[PDB]
């Protein structure tokens, strides 16, 4: 274009999403693993299936990096195997969780320009990219991703940092809670392959309805909510009534045993601790997110709860499309492509003239 070829990489908790800017789909999705002998190292299906002798690790588990060796090696193996480009000839946008400390970001850009050697750089937070997918820069962004989820209020410029609420909600937590309720119920479930199969079914096949109480009464009066899953292996684990009550923590959180407040309550709590004058304008674009939109139907109950959320003063103005699983990706793919965005992008020249810490200020 007029900016050298931009690349966008989001390193999640269960997969890394890499690819070139201006492509609708993620160009590549790889497992989050760096192989170590319990062979040398590998990223892919063969390494992930061989986890019991070639260790799988997580680069992120809490919204902060819990292994720096694993994250740098998954970023290097994203740049060597997932993409096979040379780093010095592409300005890259790296990802962070919203509200990560400033000195950690300084360590990140020092490492990214020195150990990695990029020509120009960006590091961005997640909800601003979901906001660029919603086609605005002002609003309240309920961002749900794999390992990082937040209700971010964001007025023009940067998010109000006093009011950003972190809530741990990811698909890994969903398949873990499905493990919990199924084994508490009495069904034999202990092995990892069965956990992989219920993670797949919770993400793809899962039923959700208008409410958990009405569908509970409907299922208790007569059972036909179970659609069979027939794999050639012969493992059949799914039941209809338990899989809609796994994300039930969005209305009443203590069904998961979570002391953190529910989705409706956290977005209500977020908009009350913003200003009352900018409340209506943020509420004129309130955003849905989460990888669980593979099955559509979650949005209808969410629209009901957003009707209940604000007092009866003005009608609901929510953006709720039934494809938002890759929202953080599609945001970056449009954002880093743009030639006007070059005036916000920071290069190596200023970076050596004014130190690393200016990447907090020039780029944000």
């Amino acid at each position: 274009d007029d900016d050298i070829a931009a690349l966008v990489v989001d390193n999640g908790s269960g997969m890394c999403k890499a690819g070139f800017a201006g492509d609708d789909a993620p160009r590549a999705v790889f497992p989050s693993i760096v192989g170590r002998p319990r062979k040398d190292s590998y990223v892919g299906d063969e390494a992930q299936s061989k986890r019991g002798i070639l260790t799988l690790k997580y680069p992120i588990e809490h919204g902060i990096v819990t292994n720096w060796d694993d994250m740098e090696k998954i970023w290097h193996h994203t740049f060597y195997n997932e993409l096979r480009v040379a780093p010095e000839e592409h300005p890259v946008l790296l990802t962070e969780a919203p509200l990560n400390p400033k000195a950690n970001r300084e360590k990140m850009t020092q490492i990214m320009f020195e150990t990695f050697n990029t020509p120009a750089m960006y590091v961005a937070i997640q909800a601003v990219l979901s906001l660029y997918a919603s086609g605005r820069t002002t609003g309240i962004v309920m961002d749900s991703g794999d390992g990082v989820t937040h209700t971010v209020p964001i007025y023009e410029g940067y998010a109000l940092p006093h009011a950003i609420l972190r809530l741990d909600l990811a698909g890994r937590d969903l398949t873990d809670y499905l493990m919990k309720i199924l084994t508490e119920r009495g069904y034999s479930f202990t092995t990892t392959a069965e956990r992989e199969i219920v993670r797949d079914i919770k993400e793809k096949l899962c039923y959700v309805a208008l409410d958990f109480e009405q569908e509970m009464a409907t299922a208790a009066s007569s059972s036909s909510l179970e659609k069979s899953y027939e794999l050639p292996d012969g493992q059949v684990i799914t039941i209809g009534n338990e899989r809609f009550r796994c994300p039930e923590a969005l209305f009443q959180p203590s069904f998961l045993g979570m002391e953190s407040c529910g989705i409706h309550e956290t977005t209500f709590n977020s908009i009350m601790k913003c200003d009352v004058d900018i409340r209506k304008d943020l509420y004129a674009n309130t955003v849905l997110s989460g990888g669980t939109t593979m099955y559509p139907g979650i949005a209808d109950r969410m629209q009901k709860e957003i009707t209940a959320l604000a007092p009866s003063t003005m009608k609901i103005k929510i953006i709720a499309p039934p494809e938002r699983k890759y929202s953080v990706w599609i945001g970056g793919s449009i954002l880093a492509s743009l030639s006007t965005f070059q005036q916000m992008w920071i290069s190596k020249q200023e970076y050596d003239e004014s130190g690393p810490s200016i990447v907090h200020r020039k780029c944000f």
């Binding site: 086609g135 004129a284 609901i316 103005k317 929510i318 953006i319 709720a320 499309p321």
Partner: protein, 59 residues
């Protein structure tokens, strides 16, 4: 419901023909489904004029 939103689509059809808009039938059905979400209608007028300018430069 689909009988009801059919008849609203017919009434919205006539008011967009006598006003001699740049839209046609199919793009009208897209924009009525779009504002059904809650998308700002002052915003959809600014995207369609610029999208129609960038498409006309190819021809």
């Amino acid at each position: 419901n689909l009988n009801a939103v059919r008849e609203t689509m017919d009434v919205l059809l006539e008011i967009s023909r006598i006003l001699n808009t740049g839209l046609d039938m199919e793009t009208l059905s897209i924009c009525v489904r779009l504002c059904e979400q809650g998308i700002n209608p002052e915003a959809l007028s600014s995207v369609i004029k610029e999208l129609r300018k960038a498409t006309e430069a190819l021809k």
